[PDB]
Amino acid sequence: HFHPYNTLGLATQSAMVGLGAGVVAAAARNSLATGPRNILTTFSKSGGVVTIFTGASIAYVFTYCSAANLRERKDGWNHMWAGAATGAVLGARTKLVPAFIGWTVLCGAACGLFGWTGARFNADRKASLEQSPKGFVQEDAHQTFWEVVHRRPLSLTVEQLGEGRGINAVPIATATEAP
Amino acid sequence: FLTSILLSSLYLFNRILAWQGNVKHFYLFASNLLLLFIVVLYINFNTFSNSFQFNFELFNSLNPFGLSNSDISNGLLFGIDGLSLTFILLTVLLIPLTLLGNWYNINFNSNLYYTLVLAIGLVILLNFWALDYISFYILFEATLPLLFILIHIYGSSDSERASFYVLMFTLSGSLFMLLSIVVISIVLNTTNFINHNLFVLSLDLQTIIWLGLFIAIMVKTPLFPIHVWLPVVHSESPLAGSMILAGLILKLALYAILRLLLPLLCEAQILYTPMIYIISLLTIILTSLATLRQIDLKVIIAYSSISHMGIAILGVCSNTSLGIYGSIVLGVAHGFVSPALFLIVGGILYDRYHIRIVNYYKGLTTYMPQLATYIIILSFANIGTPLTGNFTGEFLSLQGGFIRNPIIGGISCISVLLAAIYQLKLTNKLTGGISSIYMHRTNDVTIREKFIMNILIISTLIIGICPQIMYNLLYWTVNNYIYII
Amino acid sequence: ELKPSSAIQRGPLNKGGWDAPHALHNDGAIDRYAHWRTFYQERFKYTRATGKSTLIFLVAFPALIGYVAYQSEGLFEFAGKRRGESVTTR
Amino acid sequence: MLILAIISLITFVSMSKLSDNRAIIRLINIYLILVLVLDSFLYLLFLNNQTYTVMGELLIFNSFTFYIDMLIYFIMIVISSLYGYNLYNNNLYKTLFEPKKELIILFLINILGALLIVHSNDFITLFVAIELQSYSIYLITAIYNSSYKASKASMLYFFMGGILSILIAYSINTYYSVLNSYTLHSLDSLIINTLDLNLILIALSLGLLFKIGIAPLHKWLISIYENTPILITIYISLIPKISILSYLVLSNISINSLVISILAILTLLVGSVGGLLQIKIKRLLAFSGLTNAGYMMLLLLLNNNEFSYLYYITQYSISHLAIFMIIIFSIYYINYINNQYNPIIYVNQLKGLIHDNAYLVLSMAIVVFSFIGIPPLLGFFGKLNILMSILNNGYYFISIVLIVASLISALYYLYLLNVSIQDKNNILINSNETVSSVLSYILSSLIILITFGFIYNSLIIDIFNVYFN
Amino acid sequence: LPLVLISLIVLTISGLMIYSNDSILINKLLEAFGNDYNTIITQDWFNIENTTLLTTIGNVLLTNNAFILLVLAIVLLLGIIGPISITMKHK
Amino acid sequence: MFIGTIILVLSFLGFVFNRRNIILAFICLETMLLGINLILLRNSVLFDDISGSLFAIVIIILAGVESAIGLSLLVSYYRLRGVINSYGI
C-alpha cells in the first residue's frame, strides 16, 4: 500500500536545502553585478532570494506530504495542492489579490500536470512502451496496459462502465427470446 | 494518358492566364467540373454496402507518384462511405459560391486571393476522403497557412490579430490531437479508418488517448473553454474566408468526432458523455446569452454558429441513432444557411457601407425591400423555425440528448428560445424603423447576390420539407457508431 | 558608400480601380464607442463585480450542472412504462 | 579526399593572387560535387548495419556516419557556392560578399575536424578532432579582422571554447582513471550496472553539449552569432551542431539521464520564450537553433534514436540553409544598408517584401511554416518522428513541454511573415540586373525539397529498414 | 568571495569525488584519502632491452596511432596557416 | 591526484574571477591544461601503461597550438583597438 510521510523531517530537510540554495543564489547575484558591492551586501541587496527559496521549499513539501497523508494515497493531486501552495508563496511577493489568485491556480495546474505524468523529468523504465508487453495478446489473458485484443470480456464492460445507459449484462436480443 | 491530360490542362491554364489577366473564370469552371464529377461519383455509389467504395492510395513506396497496386501498403489511403460523401456534396456545392462571392470586391491582387480560396476548398475536399489518422491529420492542418495568409493580407483594420488567432488556437488544440494520434500509431502500429473498430485498448489507455482528441475538437467545434478565436476570426476575415470557415471547418471537426473517436474509444466515450454534456450545455447557454450585448454585426452570426455547433455535439454524443442523424442534418443545414447570413452581413452590407457597427443600420426595408425579405427569411431559417433543415437537426439532436440524459435534455431544450432572442433582436433592428440618417441610399441586391441567396435558401427548404433525401447515404453510418451492447 | 543599386526604378504603390463615393457618413461617437467595445479586453481589470461574475459563471455553474449531470446518468428510463412502475433504476 | 583537397589547395592558394580567390572556390565547389556523385556507391558497404572499425579500433564507420558525411558534404557545396558565386554584378555586392584568401582552407580543415568526430571510436581521436574544428571556428570567426564585432566575438569564442575543451579533457582522463580504456566499446551492457559511470559520462556529454548552446550557457553563442558577419554565421551555426550531436547520438552514454532532461526542458523553455521580444534577425534566427538543439537533447536520452535523429537533422539543415539564403536575397530590397559585413540586421527591414519579389515571400513562408511544423512540409515529419520516440520511451512531461515550446516558438517564426507581408510605399517595378542563376537555383532546390519531400517518406523508411537493420 | 568559497569547497570535493565507485556519497569522498599503504615494488627479469618511455611513445604514435599523428600534422599545419592568414593584409 | 586537481581548480577560479586583465585568462587556461596533464600522467604511472602518456604527449602539442592560435587572435583584436581594456574584451 503506502506508508505515512515524515512531514516534520522532510520539511526540515527542505528548509535546509532551501537555505543552502538561497545562500548560493545570493552569492551568485553578488558576484554577477555592478556597483559598490561588499561582503555583507549579499543579504541586503539580495532582492529577497533566500525568502523565495525557503518559502517555496517549506510550502511545497509541507502541503505535498500533508495532502498525501490526508488522502492516504499517492497520485498527482498532491502535486496539484503543493503547487497551489508554492504559487501562493510566490504570488505573495506580488502584493495584489488577483495576481495572487492567478499565481495560486496556474502554478497548481502546472504542478498538477507535472505530477500526473509521473512527477518525473526523466522516464520510467518498465512503464515505457519499449520495455512492456505490447501488441496482441497471443492467447486469452488479462489484457495489460499497452496491449490490444479483438474482443474484451463483457463482465469487464459491466464492471468498468456500469449497468445503465445502453449497457447490460446480457444483450437486448437474447434477453427477449421466445422460449 | 493521365499525364497527357494534366500537361494539356497546365497548358490550358497557362494560355488563359496569358490572354486573360484574371483566373476567376477558370476557377469557376474547375469548381463546377468538380461538382459534376462528385455527382457522377454519387450516381455510381453503392448504398447497399457499408464498405468504402472509391479507394485510392497515394505515395506508396512501390509507386510514389501515382496509384498503388501492391501487396504492401504504407502510403496515404483515401475513400468514402455515405458519411464522407454527405459532407463532400455539401463542400463541393459551396466552393463555387465562395469563388462567386468575391467576384467584384477584390480588386488589387485578385489572382492570389482566388488561388488561396480554391486551394482551401480543395484541401477541405480532400479532408473527407482520408482514411488514415495521419492522412486525415496532414490535410486537417494544410488549411492553416492558407488561412493565415488569406486573413492577414485581406480583411478589415484588425486582420493581423485575426490571422494570428486562426493559426494560434487551431495549432494549439491540434498539437494535442497529434499527441493522441502518435500514441495510437505506436500502440496499434496502424492508422486506418477501416480496421480501427476491431482493436480494443485498455480502459485507462483509452481514457488517456480520448482527452487529446477531445481537446482539439473542443477548440475546433468551439466549446465553452475555448470558443473565443471564432468571433474575431469571423469579424475580421474577408468574405470567402468567413464563408469557408463557418460552413466547412466547424462541420469538419463535427465529422472528426464521428470518424476518429466513436469507433475505437467506445468504452472511454461512455465514461465521458456527462462531461461533454456539461461543456455542450454550458456552451449553448452562455454563448447564446453573450450574443445579446454585441455592437458588431458579423460577431453575432459567429456566436450563432457557436450555439448551433453546441446543439450538434450533444447529438453525436447521444449514443442514439436519432442524435447521430440529427447532428448530420444540423451540420449540413447549418453549412447552407450560415454562409448566406455571412453574405448578408459581409457582402451586401460591408461592400456598400464599409462599417459593421449595429448602431448605423436602421430601417433597411424602405430602400431595400428584397434585402429585408432575405434578412427575415434567413433569421427565421437560422432560429429553428421548421421546414428548414435547421429544425430537423435541432429537434433530432435535442431528442437524442434527451434520451441519453433527460435533465440536460430539459435544460438544453431552451436553446430554441435563446437562439431566437438575439436573432430577432438583430432582425427587427435592421428591418424596422425610419431609414438611417447615417446610411445614404445605395443599390438594391444584385443578380449574383440573389443567385447565391436563392441557392442557399432552396437547399435548406428541400432538407426541411423532406429530410429523407439523404437517408440513403446515412442509414449504415447511423447504426455504425452506436454502442448499446 | 553603401546605397542600394542605381537600377531600381522604384515607385509608389496603388490599390487600383474605382474610388467609390462615400455611402456612409461616419459618426465619431459611434466609432469611438465601438472601438472601445471591440478592444475591451486590453483595459479589462479584476474587480469585485468581475470576481462575482467569474466565480458564478466559470466555476459555480459548471460545478452545479456537473453535480446534476453525474448524479443522474443511469437514473431515468421512460421508454415503455406503466402505472405503478418505476422509471428510475437506483 | 578532403585531405587531397587541403593538400592541393593550400599549395594552389599560396600561388594564386587575390583576384583568383572566388574562382578557386568555384573549383572546390565542383570538386565536392564529384565526390558526392562519383563516390557514394560506398553505401553498398553498409548492408544490414555492417559496421567497420578502421586504423585499429580508432575510427568507426557505419551507415549512420556515412549519412552524416554525405550531409556535411552537401551543405559544404551549398556554402561554398554562396562564397564562390556573385549575387549581382554591382560595385555594391563586391564590397559586401567578398571571400578572403584563406577562407576555403579553413572551411575544409573544419569539415575534416567535423568528420573525424562523427567517425570517431576512441577518446583521443575525439579530442584531437574537437580541437581541430574548434581552432578552425576561432579562425573562421577571426578571418574578417577589419571588424570590431567579429574580433570581439573570436576572442569570446576562444575563451569559452577553451574552458569547455578542458572540461572534455578532464572527463576523458577521469574515465581513464577508473577504467584502463579509451573506448565506449569497453562498456558492453554490464559494467554500467556495477560501476558508477554516471558522473563521468554525464560530465563528458555536458562538456560536449555546452559548445552547441544548451540553455544555462547559451548567451555567449547567441552573441557570437549576432556579431559575426552574415556569411560566416551560416556555417559556424550548423557544423558544430551536427558534428557534436551526431557524435553524442551515436554514443548512447546519457540514456534516461536526469541532468540531460533538466537541461532539455530548460533549453526548450529558454529558447522559445527567449527570442520573443527580439528585433535583430540573426538573434531571432539563433534562438531557433537553440530550440532545435533542444529537440536533439531530447533524443540523447533515447536508445535507438537513429531515424528521428537523421530525419530531423537533414530537415533542420535544409530549413536553416534556406532561411539564411532568403535573407541574403532580401538585401537588394532594403532601404538602408549599414555595416558592410552584416548588411541587414533588423527584422523590420524586410517589411515590404511581398510587393518586391513576392515569390521570395512564398519561399520564406514555406520554410517558416516548416520551422513551425505544418503537415504538408518536411519539418512536421521531423517533429512527428521525434514525438514517436519520446512517447514510446516514457517521457511524458517532456512531450507536453515540447508542445508548449513549439507553440511559443511559432510566434517569433511568424513574426518574420507578419513583417514581410505588409504594405510598403515605394515598390519596385523594373530592375536591370538579375540574381545569379546558379545560386537562385539552389534556393529553389532547397524549397522543392521542403515542400515535396513528404512524397519519399515511405521510400526513405524502406531504405532505412535495410541499411540500418 | 562568498561564491569563491562555495565553489572552492564544492569543486574541490567534486573533483575528489570521481575516483570512487560507491553508492554512498561520503564513502566516495573518504576513499580519496585512504592513501596510507606503501606499494611493494618487485623485480622481474622479463625485459631484455632499453625500451624506455620515449621509445614506446615513438612505437605507438607510429604504428597503432599513426592516424592520430597525421591528423596532428593537420593541426600543426592549421597552427601555421591561421596566424599567417590573420596577420598579413595581402597587398 | 591532489596536485593536478588543486591546480586545475585554483586555475579555474582564477580564470573565472579575473577582472583585472586579459593575459591572466590565458595563463590560467594554460595552468588548467597543466593540471589535466598532472592527473593523467599520475594515472599512467599507477596503471603501468603508456596510453595516458600517449594522450598526454598529444595534449602537450594541442596546448601549444591553441596558445599560438589564440595569441594571434589577441593580436588581431589589438590591431583595430590599440588598447586592451582592464575589465575585459
Ligand SMILES: CCCCCCCCCCC(CCCCCCCCCC)(CO[C@H]1O[C@@H](CO)[C@H](O[C@@H]2O[C@@H](CO)[C@H](O)[C@@H](O)[C@@H]2O)[C@@H](O)[C@@H]1O)CO[C@H]1O[C@@H](CO)[C@H](O[C@@H]2O[C@@H](CO)[C@H](O)[C@@H](O)[C@@H]2O)[C@@H](O)[C@H]1O
Ligand atoms: C494535456 C493532456 C495531458 C495528458 C497527460 C496524461 C498523462 C497521464 C499518464 C498515465 C500513465 C502513462 C500513460 C501515458 C500514455 C500516452 C500519454 C500521451 C502523452 C501524455 C503526455 C503514467 O502513469 C502515471 O500516473 C501518475 C498518477 O496518475 C503516477 O504518479 C505517482 O503516483 C505514485 C507512484 O507510486 C507516487 O507515489 C507519486 O509520487 C506520483 O505522483 C505515476 O506513477 C504513473 O506512472 C500510465 O502508465 C502506467 O499506467 C499503469 C496503470 O495501468 C500501467 O500499469 C501496469 O499495467 C497493468 C498490467 O500490466 C496493471 O493494471 C498495472 O497495475 C500495472 O502497474 C503501467 O504500464 C504504466 O504504463
Ligand SMILES: CCCCC/C=C/C/C=C/CCCCCCCC(=O)O[C@H](COC(=O)CCCCCCCCCCCCCCC)COP(=O)(O)OCC[N+](C)(C)C
Ligand atoms: C548521384 C547521387 C549522389 C548522392 C546524393 C547524396 C546526397 C546527400 C544529401 C543529403 C541531404 C539531401 C537529402 C537526401 C536524402 C537521401 C535519403 C537516403 O537515401 O538516406 C538513407 C536513408 O536516410 C535516412 O535514414 C533518413 C534521411 C531523411 C531524408 C529526409 C528528407 C526527405 C526529402 C528529401 C530527400 C528526398 C529527395 C528526393 C528528390 C528526388 C540512408 O543512407 P543510404 O546509405 O541509403 O544513402 C544512399 C543514397 N545514395 C544511394 C544516393 C548514395
